[PDB]
Every structure is written in C-alpha cells, then in structure tokens.
Amino acid sequence: FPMFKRGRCLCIGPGVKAVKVADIEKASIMYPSNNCDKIEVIITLKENKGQRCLNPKSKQARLIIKKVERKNF
C-alpha cells in the first residue's frame, strides 16, 4: 500500500524506553537530520545501540539532557 511518510525527517521511535541512562538513551544532536529545516536529537536508547529521534510533538530529550549529561566516556 502507498502510505508514504511525507516527512523525511520524521520518527516514531526505532528504540525502546528507559535503559542504562549513560550507555544508551543519550541524545546528543540538534540537527535537521541533514535534509531539513527542523532540528532533532539522536537518542541511542536501546539494548545496545539504536536511534531515537524524538521531536514530532514530544521531544522529551529535554529531560534526557540530564541523562546524556551524566558523566562522559
């Protein structure tokens, strides 16, 4: 079927929810996904590694900021 996501910088959540908040679930970007005029984060919130571009409607990266800001490797 022709659904076609019109937004090329659209995301629904290719990840999980609440993980090792220092290993995964760490959004460190604010960029148009390099195709856009909008600016989103890349959370690697996963069991090991995976994307989480949360921006459409709810970002929540605002809170995850204090998560990504926890220590540094």
mmCIF file of C-alpha atoms in Angstrom:
data_model
loop_
_atom_site.group_PDB
_atom_site.id
_atom_site.type_symbol
_atom_site.label_atom_id
_atom_site.label_comp_id
_atom_site.label_asym_id
_atom_site.label_seq_id
_atom_site.Cartn_x
_atom_site.Cartn_y
_atom_site.Cartn_z
ATOM 1 C CA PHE A 1 0.000 0.000 0.000
ATOM 2 C CA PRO A 2 1.127 3.590 -0.674
ATOM 3 C CA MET A 3 1.258 5.145 2.792
ATOM 4 C CA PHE A 4 4.356 7.262 2.195
ATOM 5 C CA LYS A 5 5.647 9.176 5.198
ATOM 6 C CA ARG A 6 5.744 12.696 3.757
ATOM 7 C CA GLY A 7 8.240 13.862 6.348
ATOM 8 C CA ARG A 8 11.764 12.740 5.507
ATOM 9 C CA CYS A 9 12.757 13.945 8.953
ATOM 10 C CA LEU A 10 10.046 12.009 10.745
ATOM 11 C CA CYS A 11 10.436 9.457 13.516
ATOM 12 C CA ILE A 12 8.244 7.307 15.702
ATOM 13 C CA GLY A 13 10.864 5.632 17.829
ATOM 14 C CA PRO A 14 13.222 2.976 16.489
ATOM 15 C CA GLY A 15 14.281 2.182 20.034
ATOM 16 C CA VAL A 16 12.974 1.242 23.480
ATOM 17 C CA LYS A 17 12.189 3.214 26.681
ATOM 18 C CA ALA A 18 14.271 3.741 29.836
ATOM 19 C CA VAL A 19 17.601 1.932 29.679
ATOM 20 C CA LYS A 20 21.134 2.331 31.012
ATOM 21 C CA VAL A 21 20.904 6.125 31.066
ATOM 22 C CA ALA A 22 24.607 6.611 30.383
ATOM 23 C CA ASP A 23 25.253 3.792 27.930
ATOM 24 C CA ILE A 24 22.101 4.157 25.892
ATOM 25 C CA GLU A 25 19.418 6.761 25.871
ATOM 26 C CA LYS A 26 21.727 9.636 25.184
ATOM 27 C CA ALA A 27 20.607 12.168 22.625
ATOM 28 C CA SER A 28 23.444 14.367 21.505
ATOM 29 C CA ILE A 29 22.477 16.280 18.422
ATOM 30 C CA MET A 30 20.251 19.127 17.362
ATOM 31 C CA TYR A 31 20.148 18.846 13.608
ATOM 32 C CA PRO A 32 17.743 18.800 10.608
ATOM 33 C CA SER A 33 18.672 15.117 10.140
ATOM 34 C CA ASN A 34 20.737 16.752 7.371
ATOM 35 C CA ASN A 35 17.796 17.058 4.973
ATOM 36 C CA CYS A 36 15.579 19.573 6.659
ATOM 37 C CA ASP A 37 14.966 22.910 8.347
ATOM 38 C CA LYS A 38 13.879 21.318 11.594
ATOM 39 C CA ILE A 39 16.237 20.237 14.347
ATOM 40 C CA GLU A 40 16.089 16.904 16.196
ATOM 41 C CA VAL A 41 18.079 14.792 18.629
ATOM 42 C CA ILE A 42 19.520 11.288 18.234
ATOM 43 C CA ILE A 43 18.994 9.199 21.301
ATOM 44 C CA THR A 44 20.738 5.930 21.257
ATOM 45 C CA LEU A 45 18.236 4.403 23.609
ATOM 46 C CA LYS A 46 18.500 0.728 23.068
ATOM 47 C CA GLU A 47 19.553 -2.626 24.475
ATOM 48 C CA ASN A 48 22.930 -1.968 22.870
ATOM 49 C CA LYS A 49 22.659 0.770 20.232
ATOM 50 C CA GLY A 50 19.855 2.273 18.163
ATOM 51 C CA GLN A 51 18.321 5.563 17.125
ATOM 52 C CA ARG A 52 15.641 7.541 18.852
ATOM 53 C CA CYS A 53 14.901 10.768 17.080
ATOM 54 C CA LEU A 54 12.248 12.205 19.354
ATOM 55 C CA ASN A 55 10.943 15.507 18.076
ATOM 56 C CA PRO A 56 7.445 15.213 16.433
ATOM 57 C CA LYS A 57 5.070 16.597 19.098
ATOM 58 C CA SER A 58 7.008 15.235 22.065
ATOM 59 C CA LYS A 59 10.777 15.545 22.354
ATOM 60 C CA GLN A 60 11.449 14.506 25.967
ATOM 61 C CA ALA A 61 15.147 14.924 25.116
ATOM 62 C CA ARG A 62 14.793 17.938 27.363
ATOM 63 C CA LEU A 63 14.699 15.532 30.298
ATOM 64 C CA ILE A 64 17.115 13.107 28.723
ATOM 65 C CA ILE A 65 19.538 16.033 28.623
ATOM 66 C CA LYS A 66 20.333 15.384 32.250
ATOM 67 C CA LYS A 67 20.762 11.752 31.252
ATOM 68 C CA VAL A 68 23.202 12.338 28.426
ATOM 69 C CA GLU A 69 24.899 14.828 30.714
ATOM 70 C CA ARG A 70 25.552 12.090 33.287
ATOM 71 C CA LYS A 71 29.317 11.537 33.087
ATOM 72 C CA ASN A 72 31.302 11.264 29.856
ATOM 73 C CA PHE A 73 33.222 8.468 28.165
#
